């Protein structure tokens, strides 16, 4: 079947066997940044396996409830391993990524998850004439939670789900890259996003690439069946990280 | 001008031989093992002005045997409740006893009430 | 902004045969509805949206 | 898998994902009547797809307790749009089907019905001297209930499943093309019955070409399955309709 | 009419392991028996049924 | 697909919808004796079909405590048919076998069973300073039952699973041809074993060429599944059957 699948980077390999599909950038796969598209001048590291391979970011449990997650991305990967060591060394960075959502549940569970990674996917705020934190906006692994209210609070992100956090209807999210997780189908998602951004490289602290979002559309549900507890799980890995100028390290 | 669709007897029989307009009568038997309980039948009549039938569809209602006889000298094989229609009862001898006559008796419907067939054997020493 | 001129019609949705479960799972559940244009579609005569407005700029 | 299915006809179409397979006539697909098989010597009407697609009659309940059901058929589809209308229009028709029965349920139920197509399946009457009724006969769309004892009432048919209206042994009624909706395996039968009869064409007021019966051979049961209600759908398409004898519209 | 000199034998069926089964599923089912013959099957000597008779005519 | 499979011996046939493989002996499949490995001189009997069949022994129960099962074999078979006759008759005796055993429970089920042919499976008694008893060695058809705790009596077999009887650990069985019943998966098991001695051939009364393990290594469990009842079945196929040194029958 092609529900089987399997995917090695570095040190690391993820395993399937109830997939869909997996999702590619707007159609890109990543790749290093050429020649004659590059301005910053000095040589670039490229750590590659030390760098390339799957961070699992702590886990999130799904309730019959929860309005939905987030996260912001380059910040998030900021302490894992070499990736994150990288990122506190060099002023820009570039890299694409796999991402892999994981969850699991049984022949007589129910529910559906969209999930979706939005480039550029700037916050409002709840006090609709303040501005956010960055604390609002992430909390690097872990996860803000979406809201199923309007929310207040200065510097908060306004999260009803419904509005995505961003001012438009939830349900068009869609125009980005994504895949669903419909229990009775499916028990993961895969997406490879390519580098995306209007210029060649960036500062990986100073600039969100672009969101995760996991949204439960059709709410988790069962019966006698002695699992009440189904958790998500997020793991991700760069791909065709190259980093430029070197310094000493970012004040934490 | 016509009533409405007569509609369905469970366990029975809906007869329609003159159409459903005013004026005609439709008649309602049970399936046999059944008993009609209600109307026989109903007219299709004009009330103020809606065209109706006289009298609603009845039920067809089945039926239980008494119990079994016990017979002397012998026993009744996995004695119960609720003997239905076409359901039989056995019987064996005792020991030091041979039996003679039928082994089984069936419940049958006997004008709308259940009774046991034919006669139950006998044992004898 | 369609008239009754440019009508289009409905669709409407029925059960068929029922839903069947076994026992220990949900008796009920959601059926989700997804839209998009075909191969064949196309449209015209740009004009504003009825959908943004503002009462003064700094907008 | 060849469990999947689509089948189109006209402006409709039908999908399964669990078919056994197509049942075939006697072998035989429908086609319209030739030249050297005709008398009607007038030129036919072939409304085509206004006439031969999916028609869906009213459903029925599967009780644990259902002995059965039955359908008369050219009449049945009599106020089925323009199938129904060229039949009151004209002396004389012919006509194939499709027939597709749908009965869905869960890997925790159990049951088997058993679909058969009967050509000329002329029925007795429960009271022994005494005739049917075309009521007692068919009710359209609707259903005939065969009956789990036998039956008394002028006109109707005797109708205890065991003898199947007709005076044989129901389990002999697989002679005649059928499939099985066994529920741990199967969601649907389809069958394919082509024009049988002993003239190349007929009224089809007055003559029921055969009868459609549906009867569970094991009951339906279940557990704490909090689902007790499962239909079953009746959906038919007439196939290669051609009709002869046009004049006035005949008396309801 | 078969008699002891052409004897056929018989056929028995037993659990060969037991009937398991998940919670929430009926703890007994059915099983049917289809016969048919296969092709090396004939048969000869016409002869009339047993099964069917009458009393008088207007049969 | 390849857990359908169908197998022929003799007047009889074995099939399954839920098969693994099949393991075959050390990767021998049986043969009858060469002549330049024979030693005893006169014409073999080689019954063939009345003794190269499908034999099935009594059943056993899997309960939720169950330590495991044994059976010795050459004798447990010596009551089977004409291969058990033919064992009276004969001073020395060859065979190969298929092994075949079934345990189908339900998708809400779970549990799993190693199934080993241990070749030449000497047993220490339960009594360390004593010897074993024929009777404490197997019982024919039936079966021993291994024991969760130490064992005591004189001749019994020193029983408890987790030394298997011969003073090992039990977790290392698997050098052993074998196969696992996981319940959730797979539904039987199918074990060719070639004949393997130090001897061409052998008496099959005196010597038990090899015993047959079922130990339940994951217990089995379940919640109001209906479905307590879960039995294992063994059935075996001597195959190649040959017998030397024809005389009176043995004395039982």
Known sequence: SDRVRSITLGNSTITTQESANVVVGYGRWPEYLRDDEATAEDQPTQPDVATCRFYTLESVTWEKDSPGWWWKFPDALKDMGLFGQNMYYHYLGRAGYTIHVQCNASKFHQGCLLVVCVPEAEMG???????????????????????????????????????????????????????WINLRTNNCATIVMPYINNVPMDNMFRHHNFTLMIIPFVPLNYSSDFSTYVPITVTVAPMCAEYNGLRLSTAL | KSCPNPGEIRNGQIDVPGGILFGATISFSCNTGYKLFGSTSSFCLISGSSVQWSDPLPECREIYCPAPPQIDNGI??????????????????????????????????????????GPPPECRG | QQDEYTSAGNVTCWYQTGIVVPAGTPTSCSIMCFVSACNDFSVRLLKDTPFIQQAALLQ
Chains 1, 4, 6 share one sequence.
């Open chain 1, 125 to 179: 705020c709840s006090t609709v004439d303040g501005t956010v934190n960055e604390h609002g906006l992430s909390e690097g692994e872990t996860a803000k939670k979406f809201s199923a209210t309007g929310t207040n609070g200065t510097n908060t992100v306004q999260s009803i789900v419904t509005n995505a956090g961003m001012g438009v209807g939830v349900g068009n999210l869609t125009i980005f890259p994504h895949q």
């Open chain 2, 76 to 117: 009744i094989q996995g004695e119960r409740d609720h003997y239905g229609y076409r359901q039989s009862v056995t019987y064996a001898c005792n020991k030091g006893f041979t039996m003679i006559g039928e082994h089984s008796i069936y419940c049958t419907v006997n004008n709308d009430e259940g009774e046991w067939s």
